[PDB]
Write an enzyme that holds these catalytic residues in place. Structure first.
Site, PDB file in Angstrom:
ATOM      1  N   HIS C  88      48.810  37.858  49.730  1.00 42.97           N
ATOM      2  CA  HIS C  88      48.277  38.680  50.824  1.00 42.97           C
ATOM      3  C   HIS C  88      46.787  38.671  50.885  1.00 42.97           C
ATOM      4  O   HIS C  88      46.112  38.332  49.909  1.00 42.97           O
ATOM      5  CB  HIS C  88      48.758  40.129  50.712  1.00 42.97           C
ATOM      6  N   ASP C  90      43.865  41.531  51.718  1.00 39.70           N
ATOM      7  CA  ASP C  90      43.936  42.996  51.565  1.00 39.70           C
ATOM      8  C   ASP C  90      43.883  43.788  52.890  1.00 39.70           C
ATOM      9  O   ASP C  90      43.001  43.562  53.703  1.00 39.70           O
ATOM     10  CB  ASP C  90      42.820  43.536  50.683  1.00 39.70           C
ATOM     11  N   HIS C 219      45.431  36.591  47.686  1.00 40.71           N
ATOM     12  CA  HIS C 219      45.666  36.622  46.227  1.00 40.71           C
ATOM     13  C   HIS C 219      47.006  37.141  45.869  1.00 40.71           C
ATOM     14  O   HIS C 219      47.782  37.653  46.721  1.00 40.71           O
ATOM     15  CB  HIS C 219      44.513  37.361  45.500  1.00 40.71           C
ATOM     16  N   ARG C 234      39.298  48.745  40.511  1.00 36.73           N
ATOM     17  CA  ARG C 234      38.821  48.041  41.669  1.00 36.73           C
ATOM     18  C   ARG C 234      37.969  48.902  42.600  1.00 36.73           C
ATOM     19  O   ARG C 234      38.309  50.029  42.878  1.00 36.73           O
ATOM     20  CB  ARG C 234      40.077  47.593  42.446  1.00 36.73           C
TER      21      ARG C 234
HETATM   22 NA    NA Z   1      45.401  42.819  46.845  1.00 37.31          NA
END
Ligand code: NA
Ligand code: NA
Ligand code: NA
Ligand code: NA
Lengths: 244, 254, 255, 242
Positions: C88, C90, C219, C234
């Site tokens: 995907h 993000d 990713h 993150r």
């Molecule tokens: Na992601």
């Protein structure tokens, strides 16, 4: 009792001559009709011009319980078995052409029992173990239904299928493609070109159908009575169940 | 001249009534037949029980140049007695046939049907960006050995209608990976065989079909078991296809 | 300014050595990191064991505007400790999806736990021209099923001008096509994204940091590590509304 | 003997430290390497710069019967499955390694089998495929490994079709089962440095060489070990047909 039965395609479909449909057919004729229906999956009666919105509904009452009180006028180009997103989906429909396009407007049926039978044995064995989720309401049905009158196994698929339970999306897509592809293989289908007064009756437990959308703005009007059906049973005896 | 023409499905196929096929048909009749053929893609004549091997062949010659082990007493008539796979006839050669004239000699009592698909209708329904992609593609067709590169879109030499040129002789779409070739074929071939673009015929002895091989594919339904089915065919020579940009098909091997 | 940059795979990914990430990194270094990010699509900094939650968030603000239940003592830091084993880009179900994430490994499985990135610009560039031309004209509906957004299949990157496929697992359908056509076209284009040559796989050690350009990547987090703990943290940076090859902008169609 | 073994991915691959590969390794060490090979499917030894073609082949003779060849293979396959008794293993040494790109990926076809839902394993256990170099051989889709007994998918790019099915069905079934093989979780990717050596169990893997290094020189040297005729779950053996 032997009706005058004339098969239409090699693996599905038959025209029945010599029968004027009515609420006053006796139990024997009703039975020879029900037997033809089981054997041929879709049966056709031409020239039922004599028939009316009320006399069709009362013919239908002879074959099962409808789900005028019940006659629906339709005035569907995707392969499906009727209402499979519920548990006890219809066993049959009785469909009368009232207004028929001069070109186009055909209906096609597929024999989902023949589709099952032609699978190589390993692939039959897998299909026997699969469950699928159908949605519009969500229901889990086995991919293979054992028919409650004939015992024949039939693929239970079509456009209401959202996924094959227990598989990744990719795998679900491939497995559905294989099995549904056997259903719609030309050899398992019969195509009917309608004339006003025609009547088709099909066994919704062992068919799919598709209404061809090739008739543009030509009017097309059909009248349907749908008969109540049973909860499906799989090969191992488990029953379909609603989930959502 | 207006023939008594009756469309069979919405987007393809027509039965022509009132015509007794023979080598002696007049120019106006032959022209109206040719026009119906281009318009309807496959046309049907029922009740041609007078038509024998020689007469079928002499009739065929009014429509084009027959091409050729043939039926005894003829030079071009082929007997077929299975083709349950969608195809356009002989597309592994460069100048594949334009048409065939097929007569039913023995027809199964149940099963045995033929289906045709309109590849011009299939082209026309593609969303515009996909049409434009199809206009640029070339495919390798093979009998595997003859191989030919044809454009995916053929511009019909009489009507100018664009038609997809695909079917089971396609080995690959030129210039793509195998995976991409399979996907793009599936999309385009999938439009060809969409039910709406098809007509199904149930044969009776003495029926004759004629189809425009430049704008169709067909499929013989193998649902009739051991019931005899005998048909006889004359195939007519066709032209080298021309693509949307004017380029010609070319044979690339043996 | 030239960083000590070491490509990881041939077509994507680069480790940057000699840099200690922090809120106080100088502007020339930050600018060089931004350039390396655009060029290499995902960049990696090993041995950043000095970085803590606050210093990661502070560093992140040097590259963009963080977007926001967060780690205690921060405004924007998100902990992922499971699993995202599906390709995907993000948050593409929104119109102005993130431009980048800065991801730090806190606890790394002894075996497994890798992340893979794919270069969606490389994937576009390898398509035969007629297929690039088709991709240039397609739109896709992205959904979290509830938000849905229409994005062009090809995004023209707002810094580099590079065209990149905008696809992945939030794609519900390709607009204007039947279901079967939508499936096949997605499969073709997504398949170029995940072709191994367009990917870089990273095996994480605690204190590693990855930064990726979400405008030109997808990713996948590999779920091969069973019950071994994996904790990453993150910060996500706000992005722009995508622009297609013809200048049209993405648009949200349900919110 | 406990080697110093370091698993690379979760489900496949291990680096073995503290062993200098040679023709002179002792039986305990050779047995431990063979055990690691079966367990991890591909094993890696770094810093083996002392090796040359002769020494690589002397070492390889300790593991099996050679059938050095110096080496683009960016397609998933199991080595020479178009023959009946395809190799059991290869030993591959990096001589020149691109500074960027040039990786090899292996997949664990035993893991790929195990993760299939039970009805789908049962189907796979029944399938046969034709493999060809277009030499054609029919192999069971599931091979029972002759040392460990683990079942593994035997597929890859030499497959022409699944026997007994239509083209469409063969394509879909292959896509399903091959798709489990190449699922990222079943793979390990290795970035080569000169002197690295990989050994893989060709009975339970597939591999793919990444073609991302342009005209950078890449030189590897390989010794292949003879293998056995595969046995399927029902005990049937592979068979050459053409
Ligand atoms: Na992601
Ligand atoms: Na219906
Ligand atoms: Na033909
Ligand atoms: Na190889």
């Amino acid at each position: 009792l032997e009706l005058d039965v004339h098969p239409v395609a090699g693996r599905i479909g038959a025209e029945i001559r010599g029968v004027k449909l009515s609420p006053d057919l006796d139990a024997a004729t009703v039975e020879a009709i029900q037997a033809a229906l089981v054997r041929h999956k879709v049966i056709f009666f031409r020239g039922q011009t004599h028939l009316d919105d009320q006399s069709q509904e009362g013919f239908a009452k002879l074959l099962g319980e409808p789900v005028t009180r019940y006659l629906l006028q339709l005035d569907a180009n995707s392969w499906h078995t009727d209402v499979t997103f519920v548990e006890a989906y219809p066993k049959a429909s009785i469909l009368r052409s009232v207004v028929a396009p001069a070109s186009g407007g055909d209906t096609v049926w597929a024999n989902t029992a023949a589709a099952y039978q032609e699978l190589p044995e390993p692939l039959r064995e897998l299909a026997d173990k699969l469950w699928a989720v159908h949605s519009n309401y969500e229901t889990e049905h086995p991919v293979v239904r054992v028919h409650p009158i004939s015992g024949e196994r039939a693929l239970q698929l079509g456009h209401f299928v959202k996924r094959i339970k227990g598989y990744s999306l990719a795998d679900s897509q491939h497995l559905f493609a294989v099995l549904q592809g056997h259903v719609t293989r030309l050899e398992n289908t019969v195509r009917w070109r309608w004339e006003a007064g025609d009547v088709a009756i099909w066994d919704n437990r062992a068919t799919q159908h598709y209404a061809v959308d090739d008739y543009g703005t030509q009017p097309r009007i059909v009248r349907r009575v749908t008969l109540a059906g049973e909860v499906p049973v799989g090969v191992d005896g488990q029953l379909s169940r609603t989930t959502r």
